[PDB]
Amino acid sequence: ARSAYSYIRDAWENPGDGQLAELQWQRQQEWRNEGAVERIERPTRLDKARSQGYKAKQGVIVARVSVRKGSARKRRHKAGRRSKRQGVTRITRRKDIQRVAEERASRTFPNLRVLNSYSVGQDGRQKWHEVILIDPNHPAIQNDDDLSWICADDQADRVFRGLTGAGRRNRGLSGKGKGSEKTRPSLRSNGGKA
Amino acid sequence: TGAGTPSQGKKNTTTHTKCRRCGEKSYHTKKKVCSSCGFGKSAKRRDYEWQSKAGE
Amino acid sequence: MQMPRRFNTYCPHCNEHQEHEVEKVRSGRQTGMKWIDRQRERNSGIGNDGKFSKVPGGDKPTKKTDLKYRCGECGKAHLREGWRAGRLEFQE
Amino acid sequence: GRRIQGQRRGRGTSTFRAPSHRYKADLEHRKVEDGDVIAGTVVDIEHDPARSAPVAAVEFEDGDRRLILAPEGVGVGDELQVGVSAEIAPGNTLPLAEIPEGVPVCNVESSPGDGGKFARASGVNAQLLTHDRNVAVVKLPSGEMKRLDPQCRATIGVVAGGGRTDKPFVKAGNKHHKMKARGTKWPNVRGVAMNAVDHPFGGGGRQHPGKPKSISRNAPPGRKVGDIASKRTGRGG
RNA sequence: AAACAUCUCAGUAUCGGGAGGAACAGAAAACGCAAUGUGAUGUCGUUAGUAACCGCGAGUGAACGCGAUACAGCCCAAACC
RNA sequence: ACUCGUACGGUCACUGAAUCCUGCCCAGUGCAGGUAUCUGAACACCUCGUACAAGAGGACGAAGGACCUGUCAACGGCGGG
RNA sequence: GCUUUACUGCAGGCUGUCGCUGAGGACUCUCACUCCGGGAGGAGGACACCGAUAGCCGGGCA
Numbered sequence: 001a002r003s004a005y006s007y008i009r010d011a012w013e014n015p016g017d018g019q020l021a022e023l024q025w026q027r028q029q030e031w032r033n034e035g036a037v038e039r040i041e042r043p044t045r046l047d048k049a050r051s052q053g054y055k056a057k058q059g060v061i062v063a064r065v066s067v068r069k070g071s072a073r074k075r076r077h078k079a080g081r082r083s084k085r086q087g088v089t090r091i092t093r094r095k096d097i098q099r100v101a102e103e104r105a106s107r108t109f110p111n112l113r114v115l116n117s118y119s120v121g122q123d124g125r126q127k128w129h130e131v132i133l134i135d136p137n138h139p140a141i142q143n144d145d146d147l148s149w150i151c152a153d154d155q156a157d158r159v160f161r162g163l164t165g166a167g168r169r170n171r172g173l174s175g176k177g178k179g180s181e182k183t184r185p186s187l188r189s190n191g192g193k194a
Numbered sequence: 195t196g197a198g199t200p201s202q203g204k205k206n207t208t209t210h211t212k213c214r215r216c217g218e219k220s221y222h223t224k225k226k227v228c229s230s231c232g233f234g235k236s237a238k239r240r241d242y243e244w245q246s247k248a249g250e
Numbered sequence: 251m252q253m254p255r256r257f258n259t260y261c262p263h264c265n266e267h268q269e270h271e272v273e274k275v276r277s278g279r280q281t282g283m284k285w286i287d288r289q290r291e292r293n294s295g296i297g298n299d300g301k302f303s304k305v306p307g308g309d310k311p312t313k314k315t316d317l318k319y320r321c322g323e324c325g326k327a328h329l330r331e332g333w334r335a336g337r338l339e340f341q342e
Numbered sequence: 343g344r345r346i347q348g349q350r351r352g353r354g355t356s357t358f359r360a361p362s363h364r365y366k367a368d369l370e371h372r373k374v375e376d377g378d379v380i381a382g383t384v385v386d387i388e389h390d391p392a393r394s395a396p397v398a399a400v401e402f403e404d405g406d407r408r409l410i411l412a413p414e415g416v417g418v419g420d421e422l423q424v425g426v427s428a429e430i431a432p433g434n435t436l437p438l439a440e441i442p443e444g445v446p447v448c449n450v451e452s453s454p455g456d457g458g459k460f461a462r463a464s465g466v467n468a469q470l471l472t473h474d475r476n477v478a479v480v481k482l483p484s485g486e487m488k489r490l491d492p493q494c495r496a497t498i499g500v501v502a503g504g505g506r507t508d509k510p511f512v513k514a515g516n517k518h519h520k521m522k523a524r525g526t527k528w529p530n531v532r533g534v535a536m537n538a539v540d541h542p543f544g545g546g547g548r549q550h551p552g553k554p555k556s557i558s559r560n561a562p563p564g565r566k567v568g569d570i571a572s573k574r575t576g577r578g579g
Numbered sequence: 580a581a582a583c584a585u586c587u588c589a590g591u592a593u594c595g596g597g598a599g600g601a602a603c604a605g606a607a608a609a610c611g612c613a614a615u616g617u618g619a620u621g622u623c624g625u626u627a628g629u630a631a632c633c634g635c636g637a638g639u640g641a642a643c644g645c646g647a648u649a650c651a652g653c654c655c656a657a658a659c660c
Numbered sequence: 661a662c663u664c665g666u667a668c669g670g671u672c673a674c675u676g677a678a679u680c681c682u683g684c685c686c687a688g689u690g691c692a693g694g695u696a697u698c699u700g701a702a703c704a705c706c707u708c709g710u711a712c713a714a715g716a717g718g719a720c721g722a723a724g725g726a727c728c729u730g731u732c733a734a735c736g737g738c739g740g741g
Numbered sequence: 742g743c744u745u746u747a748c749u750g751c752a753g754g755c756u757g758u759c760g761c762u763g764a765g766g767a768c769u770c771u772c773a774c775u776c777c778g779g780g781a782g783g784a785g786g787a788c789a790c791c792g793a794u795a796g797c798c799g800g801g802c803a
């Protein structure tokens with residue numbers, strides 16, 4: 001039959017209805033007084049967490065990250081700029097809020113590397129995402145077949161190179177077909193046209 | 195009072211001194227920041243891509 | 251000038267001379283689904299948009315005759331060349 | 343066009359900032375747990391560089407020594423009280439509700455606890471007109487009828503130093519000295535004397551504003567000069 | 580673009596952050612010579628200045644496929660313990 | 661920032677000591693106030709249409725404007741017959 | 742470089758609408774959210790703030 005996890009996963013399909021909504025309205029209050037990068041002891045979304053790589057092991061860390069809601073906090077051009085490049089309000093970044101979160105976090109925990117991330121709500125002026133990090137210098141993980149690879153040197157500061165899962169999704173590398181002409185194998189080797 | 199010859203006479207204030215880090219006389223002792231190596235402002239040696247031509 | 255409502259002229263459809271009714275071409279509505287109507291929403295953005303920022307030009311001192319010549323038997327119409335007429339009023 | 347002078351102020355550079363380091367203290371009321379027991383003695387009378395008005399030095403029972411806004415008629419040796427059950431004597435600070443109607447009051451709280459806000463400058467005063475369990479209507483020096491929470495504390499009496507405005511400065515020298523002890527740029531060059539580039543009223547072959555002086559509330563900073571959202575001008579009529 | 584606002588220069592110059600000896604990508608919710616067909620991803624040659632875009636102006640400009648190089652395939656999550 | 665500030669203030673402008681005075685014009689322009697009716701976008705609401713969508717139409721209608729008032733120590737004006 | 746009732750824009754101000762956002766064309770309330778308070782609590786209250794959109798103005802700026 002259905003696992004206990006499948007309940008949590010279903011509840012989160014509509015975070016505005018039922019018990020979860022009654023929960024969000026509560027926590028969020030306590031969440032708004034909390035700092036930007038806070039280390040929590042256990043995943044809010046246990047299912048998603050596990051389904052992303054989570055494990056109750058030594059060297060596996062989770063954390064919530066709050067970011068201001070909005071569009072390009074872009075300063076207006078000071079020198080001569082033609083009508084088209086005269087934007088400040090409308091234009092938005094080419095990097096999604098979730099990815100910004102992953103970085104603020106990886107930085108906060110220098111030595112740790114980023115496994116994955118996931119949304120955990122949002123109100124009228126901020127969005128929250130939890131982050132799974134791993135300590136690639138801890139024998140538990142160096143010995144764990146299922147996470148071992150994250151220790152590889154060429155995995156260091158991966159979130160910053162866009163190597164996340166949320167990264168490749170942002171880079172337009174989902175479909176192996178139509179549309180990916182300008183994105184595979186990388187944006188820079190395609191002249192940045194996506 | 196000209197900005198020229200006559201205003202050269204007051205110039206006896208010290209500014210850029212021997213930077214401890216890079217070894218240049220570019221350590222502004224009033225700012226305690228080097229104009230060359232950036233010591234005092236950045237942990238990373240100040241370096242810009244325009245100190246040379248574009249394709250170089 | 252004046253111009254009769256119905257007169258016997260040649261129609262390029264049935265291939266002969268019959269009675270032709272003269273009516274003024276009335277403007278048909280735009281769907282807003284054409285290609286130029288999808289490009290307007292596409293090419294337009296921050297600042298200047300090129301051709302989409304061009305407002306209506308102007309008027310000539312006298313317009314040509316925009317008409318339709320509908321025949322009586324078959325019911326089909328035919329467009330003919332226009333002449334510069336300041337005003338065109340039909341007789342009956 | 344360069345930024346107008348009003349925009350430079352917003353940065354808060356030295357030229358515009360107030361000489362805080364030179365100032366004495368923020369005159370706020372005393373926070374009492376309750377009881378009204380709090381009472382002190384007027385030790386001295388000083389001059390506050392920040393308001394050009396006088397100020398009274400006071401020493402309470404519990405050891406507290408703090409300078410307070412000195413109303414008119416307070417002298418060295420006198421006694422003041424702070425609280426709900428305080429006596430209705432000039433200077434004694436207490437909530438509006440306890441104060442009898444028709445009595446001149448100063449240093450009124452805009453919200454209870456803030457420590458005063460209204461009626462603070464040279465020789466001014468508010469006026470307590472009405473009472474209620476809910477409201478307390480005060481007449482601020484500008485004549486406005488301010489509706490207040492009767493729980494807001496306020497000092498009885500008029501602010502000292504009354505009549506300062508009465509005598510003219512007489513000379514630029516004296517104004518200069520007043521301004522130096524404030525965060526204001528002085529003197530002032532009329533915008534019509536500046537160049538075209540430096541202010542909307544600038545330039546021209548003579549000194550006159552090309553635009554009409556009155557201006558809309560909605561106007562962006564950089565253009566918001568002259569008669570702002572004037573409901574009218576002149577005196578005639 | 581013989582002016583110039585879309586467009587072009589150009590995702591170029593410059594800036595911020597970061598990895599390795601190489602990086603990145605990668606074992607199809609793919610292709611759609613439509614098929615009884617191909618079978619991870621780079622890269623080279625070609626397709627092709629073709630299709631597509633564009634005050635349809637100046638100009639911008641791929642893919643599938645073929646021919647080659649090198650080839651390689653895997654692991655969790657959950658069900659059940 | 662102003663602000664350790666609170667209308668006897670601080671902001672924004674014009675005129676530029678004292679003395680005698682500072683006329684008439686609100687039409688236009690500007691600012692401010694009101695406005696039956698008129699104009700006035702988008703969402704939602706209706707009909708139409710499409711098995712969905714594009715799209716046609718209806719109703720309601722904010723600020724703004726029309727319209728009226730105020731105002732020149734507000735821009736400015738103070739003639740011809 | 743400067744100007745404006747030159748062309749096209751942009752900040753910015755005003756305004757409707759969407760979300761934040763809850764309880765019973767006008768209204769009550771408190772739980773979000775706001776502010777004051779050292780605290781207990783006080784004031785405001787689904788408004789304000791902020792994100793999106795739409796119309797008006799818009800040489801302050803390009």
Ligand SMILES: [Cl-]
Nearest residue numbers: 114157158159
């Ligand atoms: Cl990382």
Ligand SMILES: [Cl-]
Nearest residue numbers: 274315316338
């Ligand atoms: Cl006709």
Ligand SMILES: [Cl-]
Nearest residue numbers: 517520521526
């Ligand atoms: Cl003054």
Ligand SMILES: [Cl-]
Nearest residue numbers: 612616617644
């Ligand atoms: Cl094939």
Ligand SMILES: [K+]
Nearest residue numbers: 081082083084
């Ligand atoms: K250009």
Ligand SMILES: [Mg+2]
Nearest residue numbers: 295296297298
């Ligand atoms: Mg535009």
Ligand SMILES: [Mg+2]
Nearest residue numbers: 368369663664
């Ligand atoms: Mg203060």
Ligand SMILES: [Mg+2]
Nearest residue numbers: 507508510511
């Ligand atoms: Mg005066």
Ligand SMILES: [Mg+2]
Nearest residue numbers: 357524525526
């Ligand atoms: Mg000053």
Ligand SMILES: [Mg+2]
Nearest residue numbers: 529530531532
């Ligand atoms: Mg002056």
Ligand SMILES: [Mg+2]
Nearest residue numbers: 535536537545
């Ligand atoms: Mg001059």
Ligand SMILES: [Mg+2]
Nearest residue numbers: 343538541542
């Ligand atoms: Mg100007």
Ligand SMILES: [Mg+2]
Nearest residue numbers: 534548549550
């Ligand atoms: Mg003059």
Ligand SMILES: [Mg+2]
Nearest residue numbers: 534549550551
């Ligand atoms: Mg003048």
Ligand SMILES: [Mg+2]
Nearest residue numbers: 185186189603
């Ligand atoms: Mg590559």
Ligand SMILES: [Mg+2]
Nearest residue numbers: 580634636637
């Ligand atoms: Mg051309």
